[PDB]
Symmetry: D2
Subunit: 247 residues, 4 copies
């Protein structure tokens, strides 16, 4: 029900926790800059924070023309971010062997939606007793999440978080079914919602709001310099406080 990561506490009954950061570690310079701006706002408003970014992008369109810095170099950037900002990090691992080294640097490891069924990957990630973030596949029903949490508990990892990213709706279109948050919460694991990955900036705000009204452990953001974050997160903190106060 509650998941501790350093000193940050994560639960559906607790104030929401930002998972914000980048799509991909472009450079060390941007990683630090993005991360610095995020801590500044979140510390101002009193929102517990974790830095998000991939080191590897699987779904690219070229043999080698930019998945990001890779396992060795990405890990060195996460290591520097942890030093400077004393903040937990989160990244997603793609191949089974990477889970072990990555869990040593990264506090939370993410389980990509497309690969969420692959047994071997699940187990590799569970072995590391680091906290696993299960991304919910767009062709999957909330009930199906139970089996993914089971393999995890059977491999002896019971620090798990569900992160919703929207269901498939006809061709190419996605819809976020809000009743799914509820069905997922019965599993007693913290639930998150990925807002940027579920689809102007008007939409992102509306959808983020609509997610927190369902009473969630937290949120995903890929923002990039944005720097209009203060107005946005404050409304969310206000709403979340209202929402979590309800019997």
């Amino acid at each position: 029900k509650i998941v501790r990561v350093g000193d940050i506490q994560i639960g559906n009954d607790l104030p929401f926790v930002l998972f914000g950061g980048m799509n991909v570690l472009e450079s060390r310079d941007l990683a630090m800059q993005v991360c610095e701006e995020y801590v500044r706002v979140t510390e101002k408003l009193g929102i517990p924070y974790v830095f998000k970014a991939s080191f590897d992008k699987a779904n690219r369109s070229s043999i080698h023309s930019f998945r990001g810095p890779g396992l060795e170099e990405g890990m060195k950037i996460f290591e520097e971010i942890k030093k400077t900002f004393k903040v937990p990090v989160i990244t997603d691992v793609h191949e089974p062997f990477q889970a072990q080294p990555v869990a040593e640097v990264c506090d939370i490891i993410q389980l990509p939606a497309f690969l969420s069924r692959q047994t071997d990957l699940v187990v590799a990630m569970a072995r590391t007793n680091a906290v696993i973030n299960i991304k919910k596949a767009q062709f999957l029903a909330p009930q199906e999440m139970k089996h993914i949490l089971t393999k995890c508990e059977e491999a002896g990892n019971d620090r798990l978080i569900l992160c919703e990213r929207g269901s498939s709706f006809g061709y190419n279109n996605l819809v976020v079914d809000m009743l799914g948050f509820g069905i997922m919460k019965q599993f007693e694991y913290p639930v998150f919602f990925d807002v940027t990955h579920a689809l102007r900036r008007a939409q992102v705000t509306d959808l983020a709001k609509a997610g927190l009204s369902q009473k969630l452990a937290g949120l995903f953001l890929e923002a990039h310099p944005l720097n209009k974050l203060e107005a946005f997160l404050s409304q969310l903190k206000q709403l979340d406080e209202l929402i979590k106060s309800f019997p």
Copy 2:
């Protein structure tokens, strides 16, 4: 520009406090309706929620024949006059055959175009004559953007007093999903945007209504019964609180 629609002392719009279209599904008995309306008027007066009473006089799109449909038109419009007298408060019902558009609008301030029938011309025009306010139900197979053409018809049939209702969307077979992004898109057409929470499917109703209201909406559509009605106060409290928050955001 955002649009404001006015009825018997009531301000309905996307930027204003949310309005309740609440009552019962169908007019079962002249007595039961009073009961329900009474309980509604108590909580709404308290919470400062502009309330309109809601109930259909005929359940046409029935599942089976010989099933209870309701009191019919005339029988039913009487029961509407009684609630309207006793509780001094507007009424909304759905009208199914074009001919009944005028008698009904004599009694009811607001008339509701049923989803299945939203596409068909004769009835739309018939409601637009009555210079009443037309509650347009969105159908589960219509895209939000497609609401534009129903808006257009009514405007061109001589009514500019319009509300859109979201009722849900088709999601495989016998399942409905409510796209939150839809409200954004419909809000652009100006005209208040309401949400039917009941007909979008216990406590899933509370979740869904909360999700709705976060989108900054003109009002809710909602159904209750003594066999539910009892836990109305606790439910609308939270909602109003949240609405107070969303509507104050700059």
Copy 3:
């Protein structure tokens, strides 16, 4: 066991050769109604394909209050009487209001119950009372098994001369996808099942779907318009699929 619906000297049935319900969208003009039907009778006569002329005397769902609607009831009937006289062919039309069911069923052999109006009791009942053939249109939001209620309504109201007709299902927004398994599911109710090839759209594409729909062993086709070559392939296909013993 499977039901045969008999209209004129024509048999309709999921086992009997397919029947074309071909014709036009709206009765544009008398002369234009005659022309289309002439071309249909000739081409369907040449091949071995039972034919029934289809058309609307009223377009109730047109976008804009001012856009052409058709000849209306009395005028619409006079063009159907003329078609009957000239071509000695049964007709099908859709009925929009309860009071129409009788005068229409006096001229028209088959009456069609449009989707959207497909659940209104007062029209279904009105239409069943006329002892014409009911062509029940399948709504794109309604599951195939859901067609029992509409059938039952009709049966109770005193009419078992029924046909279900498939126009597609809602797939996300605006898109319609035709669930081939639907035909099996509706087939079990034993009334003749048709497919609306044209209204399953929004090309060669109409042809492909027509082929796919006919491979499921169907009472007929619903088509609006080399028509001759189109049907000839379909006639051959219908012949192959219908000679197949059960596996």
Copy 4:
């Protein structure tokens, strides 16, 4: 319209359909050869080109425990037998990039799983082996989106591609097959297959007839001795499909 040749088998949307049939997974050395033998007898007797189908690992499942298959090295020895015994090409699914290379050494056609059809590394590894790639269409991807994966293979060294249809997402835990999908995917000129058994009763029969009426290059079947399709009942059903394929193919 391209034509993919494997051994003496022509594969193509204008050509006679090709059966990619076998079983779900290599439950054993024995059961493999029993399924293959039945397919081969009915194949020769009907004269329909045939490619044996079996997975060597069931990489995703519900529970971690128990059965997933023989494994890579074990599983390929079965494929060694089957090739040697019955003179028939084989097809399996590759799940990780390091596998594509030793899998192609034995299997004539490799299958890029639906879920992993987007992950570049697997695609590239496979396209290096020059063996035929059968790209599974993802349940959440529009037929139009199959161009990018084709382009990833062809720009990578390999233009011997098959597309495959497994059904699209239709609500929760439920699928529909879009028939207009076939005619869209065909516009890319590679051959297009339908996986009737992954698209979900004898309603597999009905789907296959539905697919084959779209003038496809071919089709997927799984059949078993005892389901915990029936392996002994293929002839009457494959026969019906050939007469239908022969018809659909003859049309101008």
